[PDB]
Enzyme design. Sequence first.
Site, PDB file in Angstrom:
ATOM      1  N   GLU A 149      -3.538   5.196   5.548  1.00 48.07           N
ATOM      2  CA  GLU A 149      -2.482   5.805   6.403  1.00 48.07           C
ATOM      3  C   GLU A 149      -2.881   7.210   6.890  1.00 48.07           C
ATOM      4  O   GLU A 149      -2.034   8.106   6.845  1.00 48.07           O
ATOM      5  CB  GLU A 149      -1.182   5.849   5.609  1.00 48.07           C
ATOM      6  CG  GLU A 149      -0.793   4.472   5.091  1.00 48.07           C
ATOM      7  CD  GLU A 149       0.539   4.346   4.371  1.00 48.07           C
ATOM      8  OE1 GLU A 149       1.228   5.364   4.214  1.00 48.07           O
ATOM      9  OE2 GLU A 149       0.873   3.198   3.957  1.00 48.07           O
ATOM     10  N   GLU A 172      -1.053  -6.163   2.539  1.00 44.59           N
ATOM     11  CA  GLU A 172       0.283  -5.926   1.892  1.00 44.59           C
ATOM     12  C   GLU A 172       1.368  -6.769   2.553  1.00 44.59           C
ATOM     13  O   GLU A 172       2.473  -6.259   2.816  1.00 44.59           O
ATOM     14  CB  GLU A 172       0.644  -4.445   1.945  1.00 44.59           C
ATOM     15  CG  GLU A 172      -0.485  -3.526   1.487  1.00 44.59           C
ATOM     16  CD  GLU A 172      -0.120  -2.053   1.410  1.00 44.59           C
ATOM     17  OE1 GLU A 172       1.075  -1.762   1.462  1.00 44.59           O
ATOM     18  OE2 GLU A 172      -1.033  -1.194   1.357  1.00 44.59           O
TER      19      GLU A 172
HETATM   20  C1  IPT Z   1       2.521  -0.549  -0.353  1.00 42.26           C
HETATM   21  C2  IPT Z   1       3.377   0.421   0.417  1.00 42.26           C
HETATM   22  C3  IPT Z   1       3.857   1.513  -0.547  1.00 42.26           C
HETATM   23  S1  IPT Z   1       2.468   0.998   1.848  1.00 42.26           S
HETATM   24  C4  IPT Z   1       3.837   1.755   2.728  1.00 42.26           C
HETATM   25  O1  IPT Z   1       3.863   1.527   4.160  1.00 42.26           O
HETATM   26  C5  IPT Z   1       5.173   1.880   4.697  1.00 42.26           C
HETATM   27  C6  IPT Z   1       5.378   1.339   6.141  1.00 42.26           C
HETATM   28  O2  IPT Z   1       6.546   0.520   6.319  1.00 42.26           O
HETATM   29  C7  IPT Z   1       5.476   3.399   4.499  1.00 42.26           C
HETATM   30  O3  IPT Z   1       5.318   4.152   5.707  1.00 42.26           O
HETATM   31  C8  IPT Z   1       4.700   4.144   3.378  1.00 42.26           C
HETATM   32  O4  IPT Z   1       3.839   5.209   3.880  1.00 42.26           O
HETATM   33  C9  IPT Z   1       3.861   3.267   2.421  1.00 42.26           C
HETATM   34  O5  IPT Z   1       4.371   3.509   1.085  1.00 42.26           O
END
Ligand code: IPT
Length: 335
Positions: free
Chosen positions: A137, A244
């Site tokens: 990110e 994810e």
């Molecule tokens: C495995 C998760 C914690 S990744 C997750 O992506 C999200 C997007 O919807 C958020 O912006 C967070 O930055 C991140 O915790």
Amino acid sequence: QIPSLKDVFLQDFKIGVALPVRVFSNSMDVELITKHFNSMTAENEMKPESILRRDASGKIYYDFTVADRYIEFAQKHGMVVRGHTLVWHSQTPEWFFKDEKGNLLSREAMIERMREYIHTVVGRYRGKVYAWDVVNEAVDENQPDGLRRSLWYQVIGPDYIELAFKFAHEADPDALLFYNDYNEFFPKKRDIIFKLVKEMREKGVPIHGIGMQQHLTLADNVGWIDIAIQKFKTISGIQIHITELDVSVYKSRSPSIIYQTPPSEVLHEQAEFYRKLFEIYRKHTDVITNVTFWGLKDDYSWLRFFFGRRNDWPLLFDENYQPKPAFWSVIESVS
Ligand SMILES: CC(C)S[C@@H]1O[C@H](CO)[C@H](O)[C@H](O)[C@H]1O
């Protein structure tokens, strides 16, 4: 009697799951994990805040007692491990960027601290963790250069990203090293991710992969995801992990209508969404080598708290370990 996700997709990609450490001493969790998944990610247990500690002197040390349990389980059950994650603005303590007096470290001191962190973590699991989310990110489409202004950017600067890949590749030259991000199929962010990864490849930075988080809702356009994968795969030699994956039954992150139990038509809509999704992943099987779900079953989902406490059913298995309509529609993208 029901088919194994990892076996149904054996010719296509690894099928993975994100796990909190408690699952390893729950026989019903272990039964569902080992039947369906040949890949695992630690949900939180390999993030910097989960490993970094300070002693009374303020000296930094590393606690691997929980992270080691993932490698032990993976080796016992013949699973690969995705390491998540080395460098991130989130779940990293603020003191990691500071001296004993709470002042920001120098760039030189923070590069050295980053090098030691990555060498220690990647070095410990050398040959045992086949892939790392090295940087997570880093992109912010609202910034002039497209890069998030985290403590990493403020303390080291914009080369922190390529340095992290350099150090990880030194610590394990056989690991596949991934840049991981979300909203990765939104056009402005997609173009910045493409440009970042392509430019790094062109100057010989050892990045092997794009991690597409695929934190989706039923409002999302699967056509955009197809286009994003088409764009990313034009980078020579890059592979893609879906890192994810989940599909919220909601059409935003703050729904005004919350379900106590999911309407039948909403589970059917989710089944059709997952069908189209796995059609697109199989279409791109040439570049996609791992599809990981962000949770074992609906009641373990981060989507029940991270955006507010509510029920959600984002995965292929329900609270009772039973396959959902989406499970069958995913299987049928092959069969
Ligand atoms: C495995 C998760 C914690 S990744 C997750 O992506 C999200 C997007 O919807 C958020 O912006 C967070 O930055 C991140 O915790």
